[PDB]
Amino acid sequence: ELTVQSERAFQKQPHIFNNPKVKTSKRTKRWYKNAGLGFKTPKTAIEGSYIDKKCPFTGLVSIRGKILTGTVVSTKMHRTIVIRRAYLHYIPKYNRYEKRHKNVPVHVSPAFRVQVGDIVTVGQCRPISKTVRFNVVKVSAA
Amino acid sequence: MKLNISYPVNGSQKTFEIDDEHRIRVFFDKRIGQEVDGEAVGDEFKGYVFKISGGNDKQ
Amino acid sequence: GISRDSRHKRSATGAKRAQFRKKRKFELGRQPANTKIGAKRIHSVRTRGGNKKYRALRIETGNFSWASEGISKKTRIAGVVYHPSNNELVRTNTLTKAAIVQIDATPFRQWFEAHYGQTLGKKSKNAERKWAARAASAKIESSVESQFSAGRLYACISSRPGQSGRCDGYILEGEELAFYLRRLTAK
């Protein structure tokens, strides 16, 4: 997350062309969108230089379906974190509950910066990878 | 061996019972579509030329 | 044949999956095209729902777009010099999407002379009216005009020859151009 052109291909937004003939403001043409459902576009998504094809604000994905909440338990991956959701399962014979949990891998854009123990709210997208089906949309801790 | 010979101008056809193996030996080592002269297989078919269109072997 | 289903891989925890089902047809895959250059040969593939798909082998020419001029011309392909995915893919002179390639550049300078009247490298009043009307636009950039003096341009293939059958691309301009020449100059 220190340079933009690290990889072998040229990272650029698709079908967003800055004309070398003209010379105007807005140094690179940066396309962005609001994901909806009251989710705020971060300012560093508008002002940033990362590309991230799978970003919910600057990339080619959409948020629809479930909205989940979790606590980040692993973050050392490249643009992916692993969160944990905890809940109680109810046994009706003993008339009482037990603690269960699920680990969800979720893709993280450079617009957010999260650590271990952060609470994040995520939204469901199309399959990003083998296991990633969600994308983090709002960080609400420190 | 049997020779199913057809004349397409008149559209007629007849099988010939042929014996005396060195008469039909001239048909050997020839391909389908190659033409063959008539007097080598028989002086009754002299002057004629035929085209090999195929056939059936044993079984 | 080539399968595309996720039931044959391991689980996220690392466990083996058992054989639950035979290979269904709707999860099939096919062999790569490996499109070379010269002496065009497109075959047809019958796909799901009909929907014929063009597998291109050994394509020769293609439609390349000049984005800053907003035009596009049918130009031939000389050869691939850089590929971000594999260097053997360069070595076998194969054409895929996003392959850096050299084009012939003659009809582009024909159009430039017809539209602007200036020459690269180094009559009627309607033509003078067009050229005076199209002033302050023959100042494209130094890199592409020096490429024009060289006689070949660097273009990036923007089409998939495997699925579409065409080899279409666009001429490199600006920051992306400089990045690819910085990559291919490394020796």
Place this chain on the structure above:
Amino acid sequence: MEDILARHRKENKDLQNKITGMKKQATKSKRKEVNSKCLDLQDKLKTKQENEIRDWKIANVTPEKLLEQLS
């Protein structure tokens, strides 16, 4: 050098025979396909004989500066 030019004359008379042959044999869907491969059938031959007589004439921009001009 004259025999090579005679072979070139044989080459382009065979070429115009080719041109007339699959310009007459074409259909409406297939005419637009052959015309380019008429011109393509011209093109390398239009090159080839030339470097051939360049052999008879033989008988008798780097990427570094391309980076550097931006500076």
Place this chain on the structure above:
RNA sequence: AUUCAUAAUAACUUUUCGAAUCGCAUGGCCUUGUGCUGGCGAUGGUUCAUUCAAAUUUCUGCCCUAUCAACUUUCGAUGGUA
């Protein structure tokens, strides 16, 4: 919620489609010729929508075992770029 629907440009295509098909009733106009128009249907046909579906897919839930405590990554495991 979109680089959506859609539109306009420069073109491009081993170029797709844009009816040489069939049955009943046979009618109106006259410059009266097999002249011109003309009904009810059948079949086919490009694209969009609908329906009958299909394929992937979110969350949560499965019986007995630790005399199974570590498993997965040779040659795919988990993720990124192409």
Place this chain on the structure above:
RNA sequence: GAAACUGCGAAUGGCUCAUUAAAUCAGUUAUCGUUUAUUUGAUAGUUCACAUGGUAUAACUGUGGUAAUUCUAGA
């Protein structure tokens, strides 16, 4: 109106429970990530002889092959 060409159907139904332990399945979502014969409703004045253009071929006739198959050859 037999035969045959063409067009559909034969991927429905019926049977069985061997495999299979987050696999199938149940309730619940999504396709802003796709295919879709058939219906149903819309939808082409723009095209390298047009009182309508070309070619084979089955069915058929006739000659046959092998012990034999829902086998087939030549004309």
